[PDB]
Amino acid sequence: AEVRCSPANYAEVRSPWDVLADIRAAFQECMEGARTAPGGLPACHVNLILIATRRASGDYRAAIARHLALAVTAAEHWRDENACRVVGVDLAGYEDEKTRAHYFREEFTAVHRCGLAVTVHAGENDDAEGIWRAVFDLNA
Amino acid sequence: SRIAGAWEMLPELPFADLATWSEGELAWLREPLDPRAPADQRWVAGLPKIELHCHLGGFATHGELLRRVRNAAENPGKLPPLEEPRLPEGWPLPAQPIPLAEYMKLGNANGTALLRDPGCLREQCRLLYRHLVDQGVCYAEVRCSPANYAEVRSPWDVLADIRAAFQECMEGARTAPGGLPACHVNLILIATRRASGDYRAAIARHLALAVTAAEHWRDENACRVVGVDLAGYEDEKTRAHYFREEFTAVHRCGLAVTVHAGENDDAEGIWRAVFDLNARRLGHALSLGQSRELLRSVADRGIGVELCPYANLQIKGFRLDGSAPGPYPLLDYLREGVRVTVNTDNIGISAASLTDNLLLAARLCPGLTRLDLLHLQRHALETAFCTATQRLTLLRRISSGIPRP
Amino acid sequence: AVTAAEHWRDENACRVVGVDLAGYEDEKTRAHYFREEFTAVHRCGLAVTVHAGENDDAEGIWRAVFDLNARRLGHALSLGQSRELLRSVADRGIGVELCPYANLQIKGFRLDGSAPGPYPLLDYLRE
Amino acid sequence: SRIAGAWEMLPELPFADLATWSEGELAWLREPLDPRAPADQRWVAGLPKIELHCHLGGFATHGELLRRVR
Ligand SMILES: Nc1ncnc2c1ncn2[C@@H]1O[C@H](COP(=O)(O)OP(=O)(O)OP(=O)(O)O)[C@@H](O)[C@H]1O
Ligand SMILES: [Mg+2]
Ligand SMILES: [Zn+2]
């Protein structure tokens, strides 16, 4: 399973990095607790995907930049193959003509440079043009 | 009576305690500095300083410090062979300007080849903090590249270890009034750009690490990552405005940005850094004088300029004691009102400290006065990235810590 | 504005010292749509001021601050919504101009401490 | 004597020249403003002010100023 989380929304006195570390630590300890299945492997393997959520109005671009930077740092931090890792980023939230994928290329350039998987919410409330922008302008 | 006599011309003065110094000492402080006089050297050494341009990777590059850095590794067997890169004749004051690539190569004994081991990194941090406190620095900002020091530990681990070492160093030396550290050290991450190879991914990783580190540690009385840098090779095809998309996320986060521009580039690179990358400080803006409008804009926008005199003389070459690279731009920058500071750049490879930097800044431009040195200190105090309360505390400490002649 | 700034240079005399970006604003008329026009003004080295925040979120203020290079912001009432943008405006020293009567009449605020929200003058002084 | 008394709070003061005020006068400059008091209105009127946002086209729109311009 790949669970998506937004640790920056859970930071009021502890950093979003601390929230992400706590989430991954809980997942890893619960993994090590359930050592069923053959070969000494965890019963269910879960990886993390950071959520970059977009709103109709307000302040959300700083949140997107913070999530992307946190995802890059977390991916570079934990590299153990047999452990919970951050494997990609997300582009979710409200969608219309004015919040399509191609408006978010510049901050996703860093994620693409780092070599991190990208997934996008598209087609829920948009025609095929939004899916095209997500596929070919953001490289989801 | 001292305050009453010098109550006029107070706002032109750089600090508050300057007024309480008598007409004789004010007249002495307005005379041009004489670096040959031992009294002037002692006064400059005793002056409390603020450091803004210091590279962590260029401290232990020559001399016994290397041994003190070499005899601290966890696994000495992995250490590369001890090689000291030879220096040309008269290294502190070379007769001929020297290029930049060999300049980088000169610090090959330290950095990636040596700081990859954590014990060497911790000892380097401790030695650098001891050197800074010995020089009298009340506030310094150190540039580091943690991602270059990772093989099994993440660059986040390197940054955490560096900040922990600096924090323990600050906590250990709890001198000075108010129970505050003798020197307060912050961190700035460097985004290096090369002529060819893979560097943009490293730049993006450094920017993400800087944003995460800034969001993690928020204690004002603690070492924090307070900005990012864009250093390395620069030319027409490696200008600042090629890196807008990488840096916009940093601008989303609200992090200070410093830029290397003008070392071997015209004023176009400086303009690109100022108006397209939004640099709050410009490093080595030697070519700013060609454009008058850009100089006026940098003056009125309050954008700081960091000049290291030893590095500028070693790289570009300059005429000493008023005897064609052009005159050193300290004096006209000061007269035009731009916020100008004097720093060390790489302490080790230049083999000099802040006191030598200020003395040679006086040497390069005859007519410089000690009031100009205090003005440079005030400019460094204002231009550094710090909280307002920290700025007031630093101002009070520097005002109350200037020695009498 | 560029020609007038180049024409009159007497410091002890009336001069044109900056340009403005005023008028109706919305999602389709942000500051980032005027970057190519204002590139010449930035090249000539002239001050720039913008109206932002009166009837829009902090994104317009961010655009006015960061890709239009504004030195002052006009009616930045929504700047409290963005903590990071507020810190950037504070450390960059960008001036923020507030007109109490215009803000009271246009947006409407509560007087004598009696939902537009509170007037951010005290908060802006605090930060 | 006044300036030596209030020397240590000089950076807090926006203007250095008001550091030569009384301790009572400075305490009068620290509590919240009273717009209803005529004395406060007179003091605010007498204060020197700097203006940065004034539209020339919206100055004389009503009153006698419109007729005098016309
Ligand atoms: N004056 C300067 N002008 C331009 N670039 C500089 C200057 N001084 C240092 N640099 C570059 O900035 C980098 C910052 O130093 P850093 O500590 O990250 O590297 P290092 O440990 O010396 O290793 P390496 O140089 O091999 O990457 C230096 O490596 C050098 O490449
Ligand atoms: Mg190096
Ligand atoms: Zn540098």
Side-chain angles (χ1 to χ4, degrees):
Chain A
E2 262 158 30
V3 178
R4 321 184 163 188
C5 66
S6 287
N9 291 320
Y10 312 144
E12 81 301 349
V13 67
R14 63 184 295 168
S15 69
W17 173 262
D18 274 328
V19 176
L20 179 44
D22 186 72
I23 296 169
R24 175 213 170 296
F27 282 158
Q28 182 60 29
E29 66 182 1
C30 191
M31 272 199 173
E32 294 294 329
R35 186 43 56 69
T36 62
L41 284 198
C44 181
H45 192 88
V46 61
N47 292 4
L48 271 295
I49 296 170
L50 276 297
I51 297 293
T53 185
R54 53 203 203 270
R55 323 290 199 180
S57 296
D59 202 10
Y60 63 94
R61 304 299 221 90
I64 299 317
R66 174 167 321 108
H67 287 115
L68 295 175
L70 168 53
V72 175
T73 299
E76 302 292 18
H77 190 28
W78 290 295
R79 277 156 320 153
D80 198 328
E81 69 276 16
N82 297 114
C84 175
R85 330 195 287 97
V86 174
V87 293
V89 299
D90 195 322
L91 189 46
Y94 177 69
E95 65 183 1
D96 70 352
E97 58 84 30
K98 66 169 65 173
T99 185
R100 291 179 180 175
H102 61 290
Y103 296 150
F104 297 145
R105 293 201 62 267
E106 68 274 16
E107 66 287 14
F108 268 98
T109 59
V111 175
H112 286 323
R113 292 247 172 238
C114 180
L116 208 59
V118 177
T119 186
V120 299
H121 274 245
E124 181 180 1
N125 289 4
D126 203 340
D127 60 356
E129 184 62 25
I131 295 170
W132 192 94
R133 312 311 297 231
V135 174
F136 282 89
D137 290 330
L138 187 61
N139 295 0
Chain B
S1 51
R2 300 290 202 68
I3 297 169
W7 176 240
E8 293 66 60
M9 77 162 183
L10 184 63
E12 61 86 11
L13 265 173
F15 287 138
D17 287 330
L18 273 295
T20 66
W21 266 28
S22 71
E23 63 280 30
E25 290 154 291
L26 269 68
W28 171 94
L29 183 156
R30 259 180 268 265
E31 309 185 8
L33 184 43
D34 191 0
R36 314 312 168 112
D40 291 331
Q41 293 157 279
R42 280 187 303 253
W43 178 77
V44 175
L47 183 64
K49 297 179 178 66
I50 282 181
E51 172 61 4
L52 284 75
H53 201 111
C54 183
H55 294 233
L56 170 73
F59 177 43
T61 305
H62 295 88
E64 59 91 20
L65 295 173
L66 275 297
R67 278 74 176 176
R68 217 192 308 191
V69 174
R70 280 307 265 289
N71 298 115
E74 275 80 8
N75 53 334
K78 188 264 181 183
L79 274 296
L82 180 62
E83 63 97 16
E84 202 86 340
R86 282 283 320 301
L87 297 168
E89 91 292 8
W91 179 249
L93 277 301
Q96 184 68 38
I98 60 173
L100 208 172
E102 58 89 25
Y103 188 36
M104 308 216 188
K105 289 174 69 176
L106 290 169
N108 272 9
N110 193 316
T112 301
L114 164 57
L115 279 158
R116 263 177 53 99
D117 183 71
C120 295
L121 190 44
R122 270 172 270 104
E123 190 62 353
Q124 166 96 327
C125 287
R126 303 222 191 83
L127 294 174
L128 182 62
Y129 186 70
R130 195 59 32 66
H131 179 276
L132 270 180
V133 67
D134 273 348
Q135 292 300 291
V137 176
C138 57
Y139 179 82
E141 311 208 312
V142 171
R143 290 183 178 89
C144 63
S145 296
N148 295 16
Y149 313 144
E151 68 277 15
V152 66
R153 63 186 296 167
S154 178
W156 175 262
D157 292 291
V158 176
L159 174 86
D161 185 76
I162 296 170
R163 184 212 160 289
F166 271 122
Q167 190 44 105
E168 66 94 19
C169 279
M170 271 146 58
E171 295 294 330
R174 190 55 70 105
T175 62
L180 285 197
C183 182
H184 189 286
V185 165
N186 294 116
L187 294 174
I188 297 170
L189 297 176
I190 297 171
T192 301
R193 53 218 204 278
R194 317 264 170 69
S196 295
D198 66 308
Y199 62 95
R200 318 192 73 113
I203 296 169
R205 175 173 331 119
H206 271 136
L207 300 203
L209 170 53
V211 165
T212 300
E215 272 300 355
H216 189 191
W217 297 295
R218 285 170 269 84
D219 195 333
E220 186 273 355
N221 316 277
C223 182
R224 321 180 296 113
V225 174
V226 294
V228 299
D229 196 330
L230 164 76
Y233 199 44
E234 72 278 19
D235 54 49
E236 292 90 4
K237 74 150 201 293
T238 53
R239 294 281 180 58
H241 72 310
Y242 293 95
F243 304 92
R244 300 179 39 71
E245 292 89 3
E246 284 101 1
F247 272 82
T248 182
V250 175
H251 292 336
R252 309 330 289 257
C253 176
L255 215 53
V257 175
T258 187
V259 166
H260 276 57
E263 209 150 0
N264 57 2
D265 199 328
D266 308 348
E268 174 71 0
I270 294 280
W271 183 90
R272 276 302 200 293
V274 174
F275 279 85
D276 281 28
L277 188 61
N278 287 339
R280 303 252 313 287
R281 263 145 69 190
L282 278 54
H284 297 281
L286 282 73
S287 65
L288 200 168
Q290 283 73 62
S291 55
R292 324 308 312 121
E293 69 277 14
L294 189 150
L295 174 47
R296 285 318 315 168
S297 184
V298 175
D300 50 49
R301 295 293 295 272
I303 296 169
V305 161
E306 309 152 13
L307 305 153
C308 296
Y310 263 118
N312 294 308
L313 66 89
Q314 273 143 30
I315 296 169
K316 306 274 263 205
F318 284 97
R319 324 318 312 199
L320 281 73
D321 306 68
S323 55
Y328 186 73
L330 211 54
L331 268 294
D332 60 353
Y333 281 166
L334 260 186
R335 301 321 151 179
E336 294 291 3
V338 66
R339 295 173 162 302
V340 168
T341 62
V342 170
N343 318 276
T344 62
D345 218 345
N346 296 291
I347 296 171
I349 65 176
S350 313
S353 47
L354 285 171
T355 62
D356 291 330
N357 288 317
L358 303 166
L359 293 202
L360 184 144
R363 295 192 32 191
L364 262 54
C365 312
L368 198 72
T369 59
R370 317 167 179 72
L371 184 63
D372 295 333
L373 260 59
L374 291 204
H375 274 146
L376 295 175
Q377 283 317 273
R378 178 65 179 268
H379 287 316
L381 180 62
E382 197 282 342
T383 317
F385 320 126
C386 56
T387 62
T389 62
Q390 199 155 34
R391 216 189 283 294
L392 274 69
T393 61
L394 293 174
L395 195 168
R396 285 181 201 302
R397 153 161 191 182
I398 294 175
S399 179
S400 290
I402 284 154
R404 308 311 213 72
Chain C
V2 170
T3 307
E6 271 316 319
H7 190 28
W8 291 297
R9 276 179 320 296
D10 199 311
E11 287 72 350
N12 268 16
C14 190
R15 327 197 320 269
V16 176
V17 310
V19 299
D20 200 322
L21 183 62
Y24 159 75
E25 72 258 40
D26 57 356
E27 151 69 1
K28 63 91 184 172
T29 312
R30 296 290 178 183
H32 61 251
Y33 296 132
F34 303 143
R35 194 151 141 90
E36 69 275 16
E37 294 180 355
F38 277 55
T39 314
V41 161
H42 283 336
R43 179 67 66 192
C44 184
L46 184 62
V48 63
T49 186
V50 297
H51 293 88
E54 49 266 62
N55 46 27
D56 48 356
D57 59 354
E59 170 60 5
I61 297 168
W62 190 93
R63 288 298 207 250
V65 171
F66 266 109
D67 65 359
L68 213 66
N69 272 126
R71 297 182 52 173
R72 290 220 290 279
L73 303 195
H75 295 128
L77 276 298
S78 66
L79 214 54
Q81 295 297 109
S82 46
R83 204 52 41 181
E84 310 90 330
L85 175 47
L86 190 150
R87 285 276 67 90
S88 74
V89 175
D91 61 29
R92 221 161 286 256
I94 296 169
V96 183
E97 61 186 3
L98 277 163
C99 296
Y101 271 128
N103 292 173
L104 189 151
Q105 295 146 332
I106 295 183
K107 291 177 70 68
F109 293 79
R110 297 318 323 138
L111 263 50
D112 293 330
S114 66
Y119 206 46
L121 188 42
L122 189 65
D123 292 331
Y124 284 5
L125 286 151
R126 291 294 111 83
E127 282 108 20
Chain D
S1 66
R2 284 201 212 289
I3 191 166
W7 169 255
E8 291 83 4
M9 81 187 57
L10 184 63
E12 269 67 1
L13 297 175
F15 298 101
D17 197 76
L18 62 87
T20 62
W21 282 28
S22 175
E23 70 256 9
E25 295 195 356
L26 265 168
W28 171 98
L29 189 136
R30 286 262 176 69
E31 84 298 341
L33 194 88
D34 194 321
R36 272 64 157 260
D40 266 358
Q41 282 154 3
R42 272 184 298 295
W43 177 79
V44 162
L47 188 76
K49 314 160 192 73
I50 297 169
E51 163 64 349
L52 282 73
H53 184 101
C54 195
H55 303 262
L56 171 63
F59 179 75
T61 311
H62 296 284
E64 197 281 345
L65 294 175
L66 199 44
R67 275 146 278 283
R68 183 177 293 171
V69 175
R70 291 197 108 242

